[PDB]
Each structure stands twice: as C-alpha cells, then as structure tokens.
Design a protein around this ligand. Structure first.
Ligand SMILES: C[n+]1cn([C@@H]2O[C@H](COP(=O)(O)OP(=O)(O)OP(=O)(O)OC[C@H]3O[C@@H](n4cnc5c(=O)[nH]c(N)nc54)[C@H](O)[C@@H]3O)[C@@H](O)[C@H]2O)c2nc(N)[nH]c(=O)c21
Ligand SMILES: [Mn+2]
Length: 1256
C-alpha cells in the first residue's frame, strides 16, 4: 500500500520469503515504525479499497450514549455503587458519554483527561463528583486492558499483509487466505474510528498511555469504544493469521457491535459469551455419517496419566450426538439478547457437518475464535459485594446433637451421626493419620520446606499483620533503610523470625487485604492473601489435603500453560466409545464454610493426627493444653501437640469468618472491611483442599448416597462401575467424569442423565451447586475436546489483550518484548497458519524493537537487532541466500536453537560470507575460510545474541535482615548442623570440582534479592539497564557462548523422513491439518505427547522438591556435574547435606546417583539443555530414543566414537540432533551423527571445562 509499501518495502519482502532478512533492513523498518504517527496508521487504513463483503450495518446508537450519572448511586455505607437495571450482574462499566467530564490535555488539545476539578471535588467528599470520578476511573481501567496502543498492532498487520499470499514450501502453492480488503473487523475499526474523529485531524479515538488514557474530545466517543476496538483488532489479525472463515468472523463483529450498542459492553459479552461454543462445539454431529477418531489405551496406574496410541476408530451413526439437545436454550439466549440471527445461522451451518474431520473441527475452532476476548472490568467494590455475599444453602444440615462438647475450639462429630458428613470425616481423619505417621513429616528439612512455601515476594497482608500485633504491644523490626519492598511475605518473615509463636498468635485473626485480577470472558477474580502466621497454622490442613490427592484420588496439579494441562486425558475421554461429563462446582470458595465442611475437616484432622504427633511441636508451633468438654460431664485440661495446636488456632479463624479490607482505588470514598465466610483463595490449602473435598464427596455419592436413592438397575450399574480412582479426575472446582464405553458402544445417555440428576440433588444437601454438562464434549482445565480432538480456544488468548487490575503503570520498555514473544508462543501452541503467523510476529517484533532513550538533552535510541528475536525463539524466514521458510517454529530457544538453524545452513553461510568479502586465510572447523568474526559483528549477529541475554527490567541493617531470614529457615538446630556438616565436607571432597554448590545458607540471600527486585525501579536504575543494553550493542565479540562453540563442532546427516506415528486422517488439534503444513507434518511424523508432562518430567529429578528459594533443577545439575567431573561419592553426599538432607539419606541417594543410568533429559541438564516449551505437545521422548542415531549413517567413525567414561555425551548429542530435526520445516526426519571435529574425547573435555567453570 503505497504509503505502507513505500516505507517498509524491503522489509516486507524479507519476511514474505522473497528476500533475505538482514539487520540493516530490519532496523530501518524499526526506525520506520517508531516514526509513524498514530493518525498515519489511520491514513494507511484509508488507502485500503475495502470490498462490500467486508461491510455490515453499524448501529448508530453506538455513538450517542447517556450520562453515566443514572448508572450509579451512594449506598447506606456511603460506598459509590453501580445502579442496576439489567439484573444482579449489571454492575460493570456502563456505555455512556465521557467527553463532558474531561479537561483538554495541555499539548494534545484534542484529547482530555478526567477534570482535576471533579476529582478534587470528589476528594472533598462531594457525592456527584465521587460518582463521576468512579465512572471516569473505571472507564479508563477498562480501556487499559491492553499491552500497547492498538495502532501498533494494526500497523504491524498492514506491514506484514502487504506481502500478499504466502507460498507454502510443502504444499507447493500459495495460500488462498483473503486479503485485507475483505477484512470486516478492519473495515469496522476504520469506520467506527473515522466516524468518531469526524473533522478532527486526530484519528485516534483514545490514546493508550503508560499509566492512563486520554479520550479524543468527540461527543461521539463512548466508554465502550476501547473494548470494541480491541476486539476488532484481534479479529482482524486472527482472520489473516488463523485463516478464520471471513463469514464466521462477521458474526463475531456483529456481536461486538451489539455489545457496544447495549448499555454495557462487558456485561453484554458476559451474558452472551456462550453463543459460539454452544451453537458449534456443543451441537456437533447430530448426524454422524463418517470420519475417524483416536483409539487410546489408558495405561496403569491411571494416575500416571500415560496413554498409548493404538490406531483410529471408524465413526458411524452409532456415535452421533446422543447427549441432551440444547436448541431450545440456545435460541432462547439469542432471542433475549437480540442475537437470534447469529444463533440460527450458527445452528444451520453446524447441522451441515455430518462427518467428523479436519474441516469440521477447524469450523468449531474458527467459530470459537470469534468470541470477544476482553478482560472484563469493574470496581473492586462491586467484585467484593458480589463474590462474598451469600453463603451456601445446606439443605440437610448436620444435626446439632451430633457434635460432642468442645475440645478447645473444635467439636468431634459423633460416630452415631447419620449425616453424610460421617464420610467426609472418616476420609480426612484417615489421611491426617497416615500423613502425620510418615517419618518425613517430622524431618526438619521437610518442615523448613513447608515454612518456606509461603515465604515469597508476593504480598501477605503486611499492613494488617503489623496492626494486629501493634494492638498487643508486639512491635516488629522496621529494618529502616533497606532497599527492599516491605510489602512482601519475605519481609514479613524477617520481622517475625525471632518471635515465639505465642507473640504472633493474634495475627492469625488479622484482616486480609484484597487483591484483584481481571479475566477474559469472566468476572474478576479476588485475591485474599493470608499472612505468614496464618499460612503457618494452615499447614495441617494443606498436608492432609495433599496426602488425599496423592494417595486417595485421581487429581491434576496443573498450571496455566497448555503444556501442563494433561491434554492426553481429554483425547481419551472425548473419543467415542468413551463419554465424559464435565462436572464443576460453582461458587466453590463460598461453599467451603464452617457449617458443614470446615467444622468437620478441622475435627477429623485434629483427631486423626493425635497419636503420630503426640508430644512434639511442628514447624515452630509448640504443644499446649486445651479445655476438654468432650465426654459428657467430665471437664479436664487436655494436652495437644504442636500440629494440633495449629489446627486449634486455624479453627478459630475458619469459625469466625474472614475480614477483607477493601481499598477501592477506582472509587473515591470506598474504603471498608467486609466480613464473610467465603474461603481465602491465597491460602496454601485453597486449591489442594477443594480438590480433596471434590473427590471425597464424589466418592461418597458413588458409594453411598447415589445407590441409596435409586433402584434403577442400570443407574446402579453405571454408578458401581465408576470409581474416583479410575473414572473421576479433579482439580479445584473442575472435574471430569470419564465413562469408558464398551464393544457394544457407549453407555445409555438416559441412564447417564438419571445418574447426573442424582448428583445434582445430592450436592444441594451440603451446599454445593454442581454445574454439570453432558454434551458429547469434554472440558477440563480450560481445554476443549470433541471426539478426541483438541479445539484450541483462540478467543481466550487476546493478542492485544492484557490484564491490568490496578492503577500502577505498565512495566518499562522492553518488557513488552517478552509479552510479544509470549503472543508468538501462544500462536504456536494454538496452531495458527505457521507462515502467516511467523511473518506477522516478525512485523510485530520489529514494531517494538526500538525505543527512544533520554540522557540529559541527548536523544538516542535503543535498538534490538533481528537476531535477538531469533535467540528468543523466533524462526528466520530466509537468510544467507537460503530457500524461504525452511525454519519451523519448533526451533529451540537460545543456544540450542542458534545451533540448530546455523547447522541447517552452515555451508550456505560460509559460501555467502566469502561471496561478500568475508574471507580469511585462517580456516575454521565450522565456517572454513569464512571470516565469520567480522561478519557476525557487522551484521549485529553477535550483538543481538548477547543483547538478548541481558535482563529486560531495571535492577548493617543488611546483615540484620539476611540474618532474620536465616533464623527463620534455620529455626531448627538439627537442620543447621546438617548444612554445616555438608560445608566442612564440601571442603574435603567437593570444592574446586564445581563452583555452583546450591546451599540452604544461600536461601536468605536469594530471598533478600527477591524482596529487592520486587520494589519499584528508580529512574536512574532504568538508565543503567539501557546503558547495559547500549554497551552490549557497541561492544564487538569474537565468539558465541562456550557451550554453543562446542555444539558447533558436531555435524550431522539428515536422512529418510520418519514414517507416520499416527494416522493422517486423524484430527488431534483443530487448525493443525493438511492446510497448516509444518505443524501438521510435525504432529504426524513426531507424534503427540501422550503423557502428562508433569509426570514425565517428575521422572528426571532425583528430588522433587526443596526449600523455596533453591532450584530443584539446579541441585540436580550440581549432583550430576560432580559425578561427570569425576568427583567422589562423598562429594555428592556433601552436596545433599548442604541442602538439608540427613547423612543417612544423603549417603544413600548419593550412592544411588553414582550408579544410576540417567535418562537423556535429566542428564542433559549438565550443560543447561532443556526440552523446548514448544515441543511439549509432541513425543520428544521417542525422538531422542529412536530417531537421533549416534552411529554414523555408514558405520563407526574415529571422531564419532564415544569414550568409555563419557557415555553422558550421548544425552547432549541427542538434543543437538533433535534440534536440527525440529527446526527443519516439514516432516521430522531421521538424523544421523556424521562428525565431531576434535573427536568425542576432546568434545567431552570441552564441556567439562564449562561445567567446572560455572559461577566463578
Ligand atoms: C524516555 N523513555 C521512554 N520509555 C518508554 O516509553 C514509554 C512512555 O513514554 P514516553 O511518552 O515518555 O516515552 P517516549 O517513548 O519516548 O514517547 P514518543 O513520544 O513515543 O517517542 C518520540 C518520537 O521520537 C521520534 N522517533 C522515533 N524513532 C526515531 C528514529 O529512529 N529517528 C528519529 N529522528 N526520530 C525518531 C518519533 O517522532 C516519536 O514521536 C514508557 O512506557 C516507557 O516504557 C523509555 N524506556 C526506556 N528503557 N528508556 C527511556 O529512556 C525511555
Ligand atoms: Mn470443567
């Protein structure tokens, strides 16, 4: 596009596969991006000759909106509240005018901020002004839920799309993805915005600033415009990068337009977010006529979550959707929110898919990508008042007469009881007893670990803890003058370190400060962070819960990444013969209260733990005496253990309820403490606890309640065939009920429906509202599955979206780079069209790679070379004269990735350097006669490589602090004695061998550092970071890292492509089909990762956990390095003593390590090699084992042989080979070791040098 094509022409061709990429062009393009004014982006958009198919009616009511005033009021407690009109949910930001409340900005006369007068008038308690300030502040907060200005993302899209269709190297044809003239989201963006600016020279409807927003002073501007615009941009990019059906995309825009047309965008999106999934995913195959699905076997023990692929299951009518119909509800929702045309259009299209195949799952995926991806926002006041207000309705309470007299704070549940609580009790009692009986529980190291779990940089309600203690004349050290963020639990630990349990006890009842975090397609999550003393006392609860989840049930301990959400389980559960019910418990925290659960759980633990903990303190808490009115009449003083003493103090808090301090920053005058029985989300127990009750109640239902409430033979059979150990997987409030079918097909839908209704009624008995879904679909941990195929949900990963719950300003450049790289990796995992996605990312990165630096009137610029992004993981499109698109997005990160792409075109690079004057008489074992040193410096390859490795963020009372922390951790004398023994032992057997000895004595320093890096950076500090970056760019190098220089000595031969590991007609991941060549062939040739990645990697460490503050992978690395470096057994023993272990254990594990055959992944850590995040979804284990041959294609070579004592080389060598195979576009190929320049022996010594030199 002339304007665009004129300014980025050369760069546009370098990322389209037409021209080689070069830092000169990359950086020129970067300069061009930064010099582009916002209005120019809109002018560029004006040049696009949009097509009629990219247009649709834009509701005039989007622009003319009411005054915010009728949407708020002042309540009885003088809190600015949101006035409700559409219902209990209608509490978000309303769609109203905004210009009347702003004062023009000094320099940007066309933009304005909330009037200083209104705010000050609000600070002065005026009611009308408080309301206007609230609305103004919350509208802004809504507009800030993005990573950066939308104009950056649009400009990047224009620049990358000007490259036109992309030629697929494998399919050997150009893609047929429509050009921007057909992009309805973009057309809307341009039109809506143009209509708003009107005659104004400024085209941007609002400006996204570092801490706030300014709105274009147009009477046509609305508080709903930013969210609307943000959705459009995402949809614009996804249509070009995921190849989304343009027609499905228009439906999505329609929905957003309707949201802006309503009285509240966020609210409208919340009420209609189910449209696309319900009418596609949840209504597929009413008529199944064919296609294939996975046939997996769930290996034993089912708890390993390991699966094996056995082939494909031919689909027929026998498998058509049998679950309840949702047509009625689906159409009702549409009719009610003015979207029936969209519902019906979606229903009509869905019924046309009578075969389950790539085409159909892609259809679902596409549809599901259209849902708004905004991070919903509302004031903290509103979140508090809605999420902490109502308790659960216990329909069948525990009889009052079923409790004994008190034993301190608790009451025992009689065994006479008829309550079903009876079972909840036994289970926790049992677990507590076995937990407490474990010898490890009484190991000082174990207790240090439990005491360190909550010693972090995160807040722990510091202010309130200091006040509760102040009220009893217990003043904590201030550490006046220490450069650390005081509002951290690490700081809290330091303050409490030398105080007895008895002095801080009262803090257990102190207020809890509320936090907040916004979510996509969901209402705000509240964050109630307990303080150190509260977390300490919660240990018994947490431990018993872990014991249950570890020994008594089938449960996930997943994070937020797709790589750790046991994808394999979903495939299995959703694959016909099998069926899965998605069971969930809504309002979980508010349902785990004292009346039923907590009073029972506290008692069961307090009693089940009695004998094992008899006369000992625990984690710092002393034993004591409690009032005993247990047995009727008699009343004595009863001795209890430390562990019991904890439960004793915890019960008081649980029983009393929690006090949440709410400081609504967005609502002037909204400061208050709110009491509620709703469970804390920031307790070490929360998740594990909820997981334990989930499985316990489900178990009780399958064993007792259910069977006793029906005589239906079939329902009794179904129930009896299920077990929480084999058919029910849970985590927190989410659960998956997996019903293995049979040869005779799947279990009767009606029989399942009956047994689900029983579950529903059963929950009402103890206050749980089960959110059960039976729809032929599987849902668990936010991943969606149908017929064994994963459906990535693109709407949940907003490209421009970003969660900003507070008013603090965004992190300083270049933190945005990490976020952009994160956006890129989401695309890889979500399976976007690889070429279009790669090209786009390059444009996006380039658009953020340049930042203006100020140094006292000296205007300069920080510039990250294109090579820094390669290092971070972004694959090259074409360089050094190579063919285009030969590099896959599965190229590893850092050194391993650098090694991979370089090895792929090494000869080419050499040939290119000479052809361009980079020649020397000096011959290189890697680049021959190529003057690589002068080449890599001139094209900033070394600079980018080294710049990519710098931090992207600024960085007597000292002895006192570190010492306090030290006392906290080294509380128990036995632990210290262990570490010291290790130290004097390290001198004799380990010192000199390695210099990276991990040690408990390090924790205090690691913690101090953490409390420091948590504080806010100073202006000067930011400068030092920039200067560090500029220094690295100005310096000239002569080599890469020592490890990379060593890998480059290794050469390979790529041979025969691998045979398919799975059927080519089999849909595993929607979007990953024959139309997405690289990802598809990789999936097919390599094969999917069929085991939980947590369970897999948990097998690559000698020790699962350690003190919070040390790295388990680091300890595992130190041990393995000492072994490799020839150190003696006693040296590993010394290392293990320094990390808290007992001599007996130390000597044993150490002796075990000396003789163990370490697997590829675990041993590879000796040189810091890690399995790439992007590979986690594929069967990398198989690649290392059977597809990276270390015996040259034609036999043994002198240089390839592995020296007798260097068998550990094979591990490292496997990673290098796999690196090249995965980085090469197309099918995974068998790679064969061809050469090692100086031979294996010389190579091993080279790595040993690196090993012993670390931290020197
Ligand atoms: C000053 N500074 C800002 N950020 C970050 O910038 C953001 C908000 O800032 P802002 O309004 O203060 O920053 P400006 O980017 O500079 O806005 P701006 O008005 O954007 O840039 C000014 C003008 O420079 C012009 N320009 C850009 N590139 C070039 C170029 O290559 N050559 C020439 N001749 N002009 C250029 C262009 O006209 C443009 O309007 C913050 O959030 C920070 O994170 C910094 N980050 C680091 N590490 N170090 C810094 O010294 C620094
Ligand atoms: Mn669920």
């Amino acid at each position: 596009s002339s304007m665009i094509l004129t300014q980025f022409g050369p760069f546009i061709e370098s990322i389209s596969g037409i021209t080689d990429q070069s830092n000169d062009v990359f950086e020129d393009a970067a300069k061009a991006f930064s010099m582009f004014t916002r209005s120019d982006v809109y002018k560029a958009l004006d040049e696009i000759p949009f097509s009629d198919d990219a247009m649709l009616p834009i509701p005039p009511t989007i622009y003319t909106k009411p005054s915010h005033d009728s949407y708020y009021y002042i309540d009885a407690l003088n809190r600015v509240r949101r006035k409700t009109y559409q219902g209990p949910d209608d509490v978000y930001v309303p769609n109203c005018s905004i210009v009347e409340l702003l004062e023009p900005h000094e320099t940007l006369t066309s933009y304005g901020r909330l009037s200083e007068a209104i705010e000050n008038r609000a600070k002065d308690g005026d009611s009308q002004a408080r309301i206007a300030t609230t609305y103004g502040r919350i509208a802004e907060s809504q507009a800030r839920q993005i990573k950066a200005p939308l104009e950056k993302f649009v400009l990047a899209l224009l620049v990358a799309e000007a490259g036109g269709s992309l030629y697929d190297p494998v399919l050997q044809k150009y893609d047929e993805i429509p050009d921007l003239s057909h992009n309805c989201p973009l057309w809307c963006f341009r039109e809506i915005c143009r209509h708003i600016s009107g005659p104004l020279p400024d085209r941007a409807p609002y400006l996204y600033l570092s801490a706030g927003v300014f709105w274009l002073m147009s009477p046509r501007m609305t508080s709903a415009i930013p969210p609307l615009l943000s959705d459009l941009v995402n949809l614009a990019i996804l249509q070009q990068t995921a190849g989304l059906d343009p027609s499905l995309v228009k439906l999505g825009v329609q929905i957003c337009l309707h949201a802006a047309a309503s009285s509240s965008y966020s609210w409208f999106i919340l009420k209609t977010k189910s449209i696309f999934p319900q009418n596609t995913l949840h209504s597929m195959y009413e008529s199944l006529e064919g296609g294939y699905c996975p046939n997996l076997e769930w290996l034993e023990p089912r708890s390993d979550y390991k699966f094996m692929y056995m082939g494909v299951m031919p689909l027929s009518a026998k498998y058509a959707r049998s679950a309840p119909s949702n047509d009625k509800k689906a159409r009702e929702l549409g009719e009610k929110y003015g979207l029936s045309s969209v519902v019906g259009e979606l229903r009509k299209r869905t019924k046309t898919y009578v075969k389950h195949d790539f085409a159909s799952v892609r259809y679902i995926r596409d549809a599901m990508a259209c849902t708004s991806g905004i991070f919903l926002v509302r004031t903290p006041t509103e979140t508090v008042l809605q999420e902490y207000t109502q308790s659960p309705e216990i329909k069948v309470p525990i009889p009052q007469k079923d409790w004994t007299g008190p034993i301190g704070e608790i009451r025992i549940l009689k065994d006479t009881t008829s309550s079903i609580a009876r079972y909840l009790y036994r289970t926790w009692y049992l677990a507590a007893a076995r937990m407490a009986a474990q010898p490890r529980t009484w190991d000082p190291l174990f207790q240090a670990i439990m005491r360190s779990q909550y010693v972090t940089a995160r807040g722990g309600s510091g202010a309130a803890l200091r006040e509760s203690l102040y009220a009893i004349n217990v003043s904590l050290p201030d550490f006046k003058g220490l450069p650390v963020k005081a509002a951290t639990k690490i700081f809290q630990a330091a303050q409490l370190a030398n105080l007895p349990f008895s002095h801080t006890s009262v803090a257990i009842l102190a207020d809890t400060s509320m936090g907040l975090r916004n979510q996509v397609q969901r209402r705000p999550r509240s964050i109630m962070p307990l303080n150190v003393p509260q977390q300490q006392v919660s240990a018994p609860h947490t431990l018993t819960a872990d014991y249950i989840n570890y020994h008594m049930n089938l449960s996930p301990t997943s994070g937020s990444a797709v790589i750790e959400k046991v994808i394999p389980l979903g495939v299995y559960a959703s694959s016909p013969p099998n069926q899965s019910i998605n069971i969930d418990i809504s309002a979980c925290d508010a349902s785990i209260t004292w009346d039923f659960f907590l009073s029972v759980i506290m008692a069961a633990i307090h009693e089940g733990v009695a004998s094992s903990s008899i006369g000992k303190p625990f984690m710092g808490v002393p034993a004591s005496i409690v009032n005993d009115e247990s047995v009727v009449g008699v009343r004595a003083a009863r001795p209890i253990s430390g562990m019991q003493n904890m439960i004793q103090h915890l019960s008081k808090l649980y029983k009393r309820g929690f006090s949440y301090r709410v400081n609504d920053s967005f609502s002037p005058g909204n400061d208050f403490t709110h009491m509620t029985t709703t469970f804390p989300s920031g307790s070490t127990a929360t998740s594990t606890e909820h997981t334990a009750n989930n499985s316990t109640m489900m178990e009780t239902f399958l064993t007792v309640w259910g069977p006793e409430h029906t005589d239906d033979p079939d329902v009794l059979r179904l129930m009896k065939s299920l077990t929480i150990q084999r058919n029910y997987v849970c985590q927190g409030d989410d659960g998956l009920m997996i019903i293995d079918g049979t040869t005779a097909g799947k279990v009767n839908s009606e029989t399942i429906q009956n047994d689900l209704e029983l579950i529903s009624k059963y929950g009402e008995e103890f206050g749980w509202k089960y959110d059960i879904a039976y729809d032929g679909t599987a849902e668990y941990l936010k991943l969606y599955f149908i017929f064994g195929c994963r459906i990535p949900n693109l709407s949940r990963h907003p490209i421009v979206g970003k969660e900003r719950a507070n008013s603090s300003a965004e992190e300083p450049w270049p933190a945005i780079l990490d976020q952009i790289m994160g956006v890129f990796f989401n695309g890889v995992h979500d399976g976007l069209q690889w070429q279009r996605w790669i090209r786009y990312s390059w444009a996006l990165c380039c658009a953020f790679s340049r930042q203006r630096t100020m140094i006292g009137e000296s205007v300069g610029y920080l510039q990250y070379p294109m090579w820094s992004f390669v290092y971070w993981g972004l694959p090259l499109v074409k360089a050094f004269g190579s063919d285009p698109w030969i590099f896959s997005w599965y190229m590893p990160t850092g050194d391993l990735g650098m090694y991979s792409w370089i090895s792929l075109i090494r000869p080419l690079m050499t040939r290119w350097m000479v052809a361009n004057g980079y020649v020397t008489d000096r011959c290189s074992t890697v680049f021959g006669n190529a003057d690589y040193r002068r080449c890599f410096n001139e094209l900033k390859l070394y600079q980018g490589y080294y710049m990519a490795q710098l931090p992207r963020n600024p960085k007597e009372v000292r002895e006192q602090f570190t010492q306090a922390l030290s006392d906290y951790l080294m509380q128990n004398p036995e632990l210290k004695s262990r570490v010291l023994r290790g130290r004097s032992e390290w001198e004799k057997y380990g010192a000199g061998i390695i210099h990276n000895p991990p040690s408990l004595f390090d924790v205090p320093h690691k913690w101090y550092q953490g409390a420091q890096e948590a504080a806010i950076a100073t202006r000067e500090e930011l400068a030092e970071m920039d200067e560090t970056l500029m220094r690295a760019r100005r310096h000239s190098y002569s080599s890469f890292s020592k490890l990379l220089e060593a890998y480059l000595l290794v050469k390979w031969r790529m041979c025969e492509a691998r045979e398919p590991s799975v059927d080519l007609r089999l849909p595993l991941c929607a979007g990953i089909d024959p139309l997405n060549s690289d990802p598809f062939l990789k999936m097919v040739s390599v094969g999917p990762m069929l085991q939980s990645t947590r369970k897999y990697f948990a097998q690559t460490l000698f020790m699962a956990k350690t003190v919070s503050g040390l790295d388990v992978n680091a300890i595992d690395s130190a041990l393995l390095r000492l072994r490799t470096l020839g150190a003696d057994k006693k040296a590993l023993t010394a290392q293990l003593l320094m990390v808290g272990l007992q001599e007996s254990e130390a000597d044993a594990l150490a002796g075990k390590i000396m003789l163990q055959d370490v697997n590829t992944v675990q041993l590879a850590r000796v040189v810091n090699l890690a399995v790439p995040d992007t590979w986690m979804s594929l069967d990398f284990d198989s690649m290392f084992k059977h597809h990276v041959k270390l015996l040259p294609k034609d036999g043994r070579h002198l240089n390839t042989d592995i020296p007798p004592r260097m068998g550990w080389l094979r591990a490292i060598l496997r990673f290098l080979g796999a690196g090249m195979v995965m980085t090469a576009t197309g099918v995974a190929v068998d790679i064969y070791l061809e050469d090692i320049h100086g031979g294996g022996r010389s190579l091993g010594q080279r790595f040993m040098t690196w090993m012993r030199q670390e931290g020197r």
